[PDB]
Symmetry: D4
């Protein structure tokens, strides 16, 4: 388990992270963590590592792109003095390109995305114990669907950033891909973005695996 | 204009047809028709053929399959004594196979679909002046997406039944396919089924074209 | 089609334009365009010209007279940098004269109306590709009903402004008049102002015809 | 004062009478009578004839025609054992012919209107001390407006039935016509049917005058 | 009729005047005048004197004493430039003495009341055509009930002010007293302050009589 | 303490007893007992006699008279198999004579009151361990107020029936009368019937005193 | 994995199982399963065994005891034709003995509990492929707390019945006891029964472990 | 009775004091005192000492620790100029240690608690007639339950402060302890903090006894 006793783990991202979390504080009461993968992660950590005494904060905001994250980074991340920061961003940066293809100011293209995300990591890295970069995802098994194809390009950039910055790394797309060998997307998410409890468990598990969670500790 | 003065036109279907229509009556107002294509068709007919004196009823019910239509046909169609019946059914029949793949009782497979729809059309036809068969659709440009592929099969059934029974026929898939040469699905419907006003205009326009509507009457 | 690819079309007016649109932005999501003629226009343009990539904004505000429009013109119109502006105003300027005949500060008489509307056109004209002036209307077939008689005087002023300024022009009254040869007003609007979907389609069609929309493009 | 101590006065009609009255009872309160002319009549009687000891019941139902009155007459009128019955019906009977001109089953044409109203009055008359027949009305000063013209025809029927049956008669059209020499309809009712407090006072005053109310009792 | 054509009549007072009126403006739409005597007065004036074109504003605020009135007089009365001001205040000034006998800062005793009310009249008198002073009331027929006894002392002060300042004068208590020879208070108001429609008609009539309203004009 | 361990105490009455109790059961909770004297009695018994193990049921219904109690007695009292039944009824029986003086069917006059209450007590008495008869009350210090005078007559009936049947008796009028030596009614209840927490403590304390409650148990 | 492809797994119980599940069906969605352990179990199975094709139904009802389960067993369990039935009942059976100690009819004592649960298991067993018996629990680390002590007795009954009937068995008390070595009860559940997401993960994990779930499948 | 005529008694504390009281004023209307022990105290004082004319204010705020009290002391206590101040605080200062054991900034440990509470007393003492210190409590009969054990340490500090400062003193824990010889905590409070009406009566009684209230005055 990478996360140590007494440390503060902060999650940030878009609606997939937000899931109705309490604003502004996003802390403690799970009511306050929202009803998706962040809350599930905290639950499982408490169920299996109750003694670790990890504090968790949810700074997800529905609708955000990486440009939105940069705009609130000082208040929502730096000022919180986390020990660990998890970032999952990109879904909207890409989705807007396809659902509002003519409101271009809503779009964040790949070059801007990469540099902005790198800038967040590099600002934050000296201040924390570690960073976990989760790729964005699209719940769609056809690699050639235009939105899946674009999402994968953003995900590959995330992976590159994580390698270069020695951040931990969660390929959320690869985790969905496995399940999409059996299920059609709609079984997980009508809209291919916002999933059922099962999708949130896919995410929570993928995150927990990357931080060295054991389902039954040998320890 | 295939529909004539004084005739009663009854639309039945699933949520695409329902669109919040007044239950049980589906008639009577400044709003009883709901807020999608049926209302738009009735609006445009009134704007361009005010003298036609058409009565229009909306018997759409969200979530229905053709099995659900059969269960209420006597009360919701036959007992209304319509002159024209428009049917658009199959979206759910198919979609449940994909979004709830293990709840097999919710699925209406092709055999049940063909047999039921065929039987309703045969029974109804000698009781009315005319039938309009609209295909189901899925807002997805890739013909080999599994749900689009199945939906196209169901649409072939509708087409065959309309041909055999001399009904009017609206290929709603073809109408969406034309727009999908330009737009990604999410620009019309995040879930690929319930679209924006634009999608309901696509539907309304495909319906009107089939019944011989003229945008500016040529006389 | 007068409107070009990539251009921004902004609608302003009173409740007939507003129809519950999102405030302040009035953009994109049709939810955001409201539920009347503006949304129908966008829908039909997307259904038939999806490739044009036109951005549409709804700045209608329920209750406004032309005096109200002038008061918000800088923020709601100029600052939006539209390429095309459609104005439909006058209904309230006149209605107040008849429903609150003794709260005279609510009234905008014809001389003030004309000069204010001219002032909006003349301010805006050098900044845009084009202006569309839609007359106000009253859904009442008797030319001698006092409110219809006054409305027609305002409409004639609109027409004069449009001629003088080389703006496009939509005679909404003439469009209702045609339909009122068959329907009594109440069939369209109990209050003779706020109409059913059909009235909104009357308006949307009248607008679309003036901008060279084709229902089936030969192009 | 035609109404005497201890008598029970029952009002029946459509929304003009209903005005949000308590269902099913229409009696019993600080509010059971609704918020329009019936409450005003009861208020003024209590203010000026507190000793009369009148019980007053409001059996108005929004949307009713005389066909609807017939269907509930036994339960809502006869079974209440009233002493005086006031009827004001016909607005909807007529209005549906104009606002829903093609839904012919909602219309109550003159033959059905005369026959039904006549029959209810004849049946009721020997069971009660007295009947007040109020005409329907339409708040429209132009006698050749088609709906005003029809409404005046229906009012002639009421007048004839009251004359023949020796009932009291209130010409509510004439009461509005006097005010309409000064005010445009919209100043009293946008929809020409459901008026302001002022319209309900016009109605209440026309009712009171007919039953011999004195504003300052002359004794 | 004391009130002239085109003039502005403003009502101020406590809840009996407020009756849910629109804040802040209190004007025009009766919805905006509230649902009690002020609205009834306007209704009757419109029903019987529609040509007078009187503008009416309701500045009642629930809970107010005369001390509260003085605190808002500049904004709510002076700045409105009325031609006629009606004041009805005192109920709370007295009621607080009896319902919250130990929260003495809520009480306005008679000496303070008299001088404050005189101060309002004297400030206003040079600015208006006329002032109407309505006494407070208590719906209680026993002159020796402590609250009735106190209310009558306030009412006698009002009468004295009106005489001295040549204001019009409405003895609301005397009007209730007449009706209380027949009805027990509860029939009009459970709480002896807030009455039914009938109480509001008692008030509206009493006011109208003092301004020379005729129920049927001989004129 | 007249009530003994393991006994079931059932309270019945009108709104004074109901106080928002859970329907139909009136038992079972942190709130099923409502928010007035019944809850207070149960609270104080638990605070001071926790070991008594009393089950307490609240069958109060707002608006009831003794005629209403008779209609539900079998289901709400007898079928509950209580050990002790507390009755407080008569407020409405009387009040309707004053607040709705002309709706005579809502009144329960003394003959009907005495006969009904007597009969319920006689029928119930051999089925239970004991009965507590609480008088109705009216929060009004003037014995010659007409409603107070009648209410005192009804209370004499209760007292007589309790004496004759060897029931316990609580004179709730006398309890209020003591406080009314100091407080005007409105300080306890604007409407002289539904009081503050203080009034419900007056009631609870009068009930407890009768059943032999000690505030500090003397043993 | 004890549960096999295509099988239907039905959970029944009290609020711990219910967690806001859809009534009556408890199946069908993105939410019909409620928001606690049953949803989490279904989520994790789908995330890790997507190919298993399990149908899962939630027949939990808040407030139930085993007596309540018996009353609905035929309709809610037997008629659903499940393959696997999971039961978690006893919390209320016990808790009512402590929170409503004098309402003895709400209690289900050990004799009734053992006999009823035994009978449901015996009846169900030959109709299904398998049964999972989960113990009730109380989130309280002190074995001599009276309610914890009783709850442990009830859990011994469940354990004995599962042993005798060859059912699977989940000791939910033991799962909580492990966490309670570190956390005070209130950190998981203020009321010691309805826990946080963490408590529902404790439950879900204890269920999964018993059915042979692997967090990372070893194949 | 320690409290004198005309004096102001102010209560402050956490939710147990707040109980939904009106913010900010917390005065008079009991609605305004909330629905627990503060309101019950006022009720009983009014029922038994109506002539004392005591003014009572409720400044409880749900969630507060003593640190929160100090932060609002000037505005909520000093500025109110009370004659008597009752303080009950400590529950949250302790509870947070056990329900959010890793959000340590929420915790107020005993040393800080003692000094802060002393500081409030010492600031206030010269300004008031008297201070009543109520211990915090935990409804849990096992002295060795960790939270009960801690609460008792805070309570012993309160007692020490009260002795040293000659404040009145209410041992709320001792009052619950007596009742807990019979009832399991859940019968009073599922969460062991927020109790039923009975718990609030335990508190109200304990307070009243310390101020010399007599249930039947000999006086
Ligand atoms: Cl989002
Ligand atoms: Cl659907
Ligand atoms: Cl408008
Ligand atoms: Cl109506
Ligand atoms: Cl008031
Ligand atoms: Cl009641
Ligand atoms: Cl439960
Ligand atoms: Cl609290």
């Amino acid at each position: 388990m990478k996360i140590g006793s007494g440390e503060k783990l902060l999650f940030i991202g878009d609606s997939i992270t937000d899931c109705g979390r309490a604003r502004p504080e996003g802390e403690g009461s799970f009511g306050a963590l929202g009803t998706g993968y962040v809350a599930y992660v905290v639950g499982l950590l408490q169920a299996v590592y109750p003694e670790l005494g990890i504090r968790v904060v949810n700074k997800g905001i529905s609708g955000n792109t990486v440009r939105d994250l940069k705009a609130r980074w000082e208040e929502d991340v730096i000022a919180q003095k986390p020990d660990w920061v998890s970032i999952m961003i990109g879904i909207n940066d890409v989705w807007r390109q396809y659902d509002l293809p003519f409101m271009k100011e809503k779009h964040v293209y790949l070059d801007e995305y990469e540099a902005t995300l790198r800038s967040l990591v590099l600002e934050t890295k000296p201040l924390v114990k570690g960073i976990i970069l989760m790729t964005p995802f699209y719940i769609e098994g056809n690699e050639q669907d235009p939105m899946r194809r674009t999402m994968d390009q953003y995900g590959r950039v995330v992976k590159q950033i994580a390698e270069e910055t020695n951040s931990l790394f969660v390929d959320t797309q690869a985790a969905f891909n496995e399940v999409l060998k059996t299920l059609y997307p709609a079984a997980l998410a009508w809209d291919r973005v916002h999933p059922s409890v099962a999708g949130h468990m896919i995410l929570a598990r993928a995150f927990l695996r990357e931080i060295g969670f054991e389902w039954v500790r040998s320890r």
